[PDB]
Amino acid sequence: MGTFREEGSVSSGTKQEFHTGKLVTTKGDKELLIDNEKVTSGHTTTTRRSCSKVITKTVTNADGRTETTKEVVKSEDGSDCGDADFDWHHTFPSRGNLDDFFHRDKDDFFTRSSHEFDGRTGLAPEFAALGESGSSSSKTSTHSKQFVSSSTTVNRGGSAIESKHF
């Protein structure tokens, strides 16, 4: 029925979905340049790592001049990484207590038991000087014939005057 152009399979694809509709299948980019990163994830990482502070600069040259600055710096001030740290100090659980170390809260009459020497009294055995004690007497001793005693014969005559001889 009409030869038209029948010869074997003047067509394409197991079935034409919508007749031809493309000149060049190779090139065809006309909007693929769309932003891939889009407004979302997009920051540096190989150069420096956020959060903490990490700076690494490595340069290699042919004359063997190669400076390695692969250095790493801890957090800058614990902005959002080295948190929970502030400064080392630790703290003891709870020591005993006993009395005050020096504040001396409630004082007391019992002061320091200083073995000083506030002594000063010294009664002597006996005042060796006056000695007016005893009983107002001391001349008594050898009992010398100091006491006068002989005036008496002049007393009354033993009888009467009488010149015997003459």
From Swiss-Prot:
Residues 146-156 have a biased composition (Polar residues). Disulfide bonds join 51-81. Conversion of fibrinogen to fibrin is triggered by thrombin, which cleaves fibrinopeptides A and B from alpha and beta chains, and thus exposes the N-terminal polymerization sites responsible for the formation of the soft clot. The soft clot is converted into the hard clot by factor XIIIA which catalyzes the epsilon-(gamma-glutamyl)lysine cross-linking between gamma chains (stronger) and between alpha chains (weaker) of different monomers. Forms F13A-mediated cross-links between a glutamine and the epsilon-amino group of a lysine residue, forming fibronectin-fibrinogen heteropolymers. It is found in: Secreted. Residues 133-145 have a biased composition (Low complexity). It comes from the Eukaryota. A long coiled coil structure formed by 3 polypeptide chains connects the central nodule to the C-terminal domains (distal nodules). The long C-terminal ends of the alpha chains fold back, contributing a fourth strand to the coiled coil structure. Cleaved by the protease thrombin to yield monomers which, together with fibrinogen beta (FGB) and fibrinogen gamma (FGG), polymerize to form an insoluble fibrin matrix. Fibrin has a major function in hemostasis as one of the primary components of blood clots. In addition, functions during the early stages of wound repair to stabilize the lesion and guide cell migration during re-epithelialization. Was originally thought to be essential for platelet aggregation, based on in vitro studies using anticoagulated blood. This is Fibrinogen alpha chain. The lineage of its organism: Eukaryota, Metazoa, Chordata, Craniata, Vertebrata. The chain holds residues 406 to 570 of 615 of the full protein.
